[PDB]
Symmetry: D2
């Protein structure tokens, strides 16, 4: 599992469940090609997006659909979504955990990269 996404809710102090996540890869023509998608589970984690074979070097965009998450809780948040853009595997294959901590008008995102 080379790419995992974990999302927490800073208002409730709980995992953020059922959060939609769309991943894109920058193509040779400079456009964003859809790469993988899924939704977080009860643990706030999204596993199985891709495989080591498919996850080649490139620039990736992880789009976390925070607006839909907050709206379902009765909240009108600031951001449309949280976007996380990074080059992956340029020094060989690595495992990436993309974490996000959500509040209605703020979010943080962190990458944990292991070899």
């Amino acid at each position: 599992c080379p790419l995992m996404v974990k999302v927490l809710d800073a208002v409730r102090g709980s995992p953020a469940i059922n959060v939609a996540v769309h991943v894109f890869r920058k193509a040779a023509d400079d456009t964003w090609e859809p790469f993988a998608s899924g939704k977080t589970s009860e643990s706030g984690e999204l596993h199985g997006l891709t495989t080591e074979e498919e996850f080649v070097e490139g620039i990736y965009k992880v789009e976390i659909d925070t607006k839909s998450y907050w709206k379902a809780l009765g909240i009108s948040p600031f951001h449309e979504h949280a976007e996380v853009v990074f080059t992956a595997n340029d020094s060989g294959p690595r495992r990436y955990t993309i974490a996000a901590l959500l509040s209605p008008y703020s979010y943080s995102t962190t990458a944990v990269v292991t070899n």
Copy 2:
């Protein structure tokens, strides 16, 4: 100015100076059209991006060039840039400050919306 950007450096405990910022507006065809740009000052702030007249309701994207910032400091960063995407609304407060706190492998962004 209705839209301001403020950036801090979490490693040095200082304003993040000379950080390039590009603002885009979502067009009818869903593409991003350049709207405004600038570099943060010695105070880490970017003022004068737009005007009350030009800043109409719509979806905007604020792109913070964090990769170049860390590169200039000789520190290996994770993200290509920090992206802040939001809808501007005439209802609530009229002043938007997009704040960002930067670390090499993590960043936080907050919208401070006031009158």
Copy 3:
């Protein structure tokens, strides 16, 4: 002022107003002696805590009363308060801004130290 405190509300996207702040200095016997206190203004800032003369080198604790802040808003919080503990040094920059970003179950704090 050599020491300023600035607090933001991550839920409302606004300055955190009327937040009580207590500053302590570490005494010879290792106990915390009250040093200065105040409430954040409508801008979320607390100025005038101390003076250049009084703010000598030493270890200080800045206590931010986050529990009462959330309580007043009818929102259940996790922490009793946010504590910021640091050593004041004559060497580096002389102005200390203790920034804090508050959510009910999470907070971030950053020291912006400048001239």
Copy 4:
């Protein structure tokens, strides 16, 4: 495992290993009684601090020794330590994960509480 501590390094994008953690409980006499201690492992996690039986209702303080961590990496950071203070188990037993994200001049801390 009712109380776990997890620490990440925002500069390296990795778990923060060998970080000392001291936990205290507020006594009936208003003083901080030492409750448990340990150090984070290779995963940046600290397990086995206490048991459900020992972890009764009370106000707890989790002190994370961030200064020593940064110093070992050649960095002189701002904070002496990160303190996390909270009431636990006032509505019956819960499981608490205390997370911290470290940068030299900034840190965030989040609580994930489950039943």
